[PDB]
Amino acid sequence: KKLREVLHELYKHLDSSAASQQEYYPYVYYKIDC
């Protein structure tokens, strides 16, 4: 969760305009699991 906040900060300046967030993050990501 601390990474969620920190990476939100580190990737919001990439967009710096339009993108509530929900699933349309300012970064690219997919989850791999068990």
Binding site: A18, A19, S20, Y24
Partner: peptide
Amino acid sequence: GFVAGVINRERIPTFERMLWRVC
């Protein structure tokens, strides 16, 4: 050719953002 869809200031700042984000 731009085609104009009209909405009555229902949620332009939100669903217009959503249109930008999905299309």
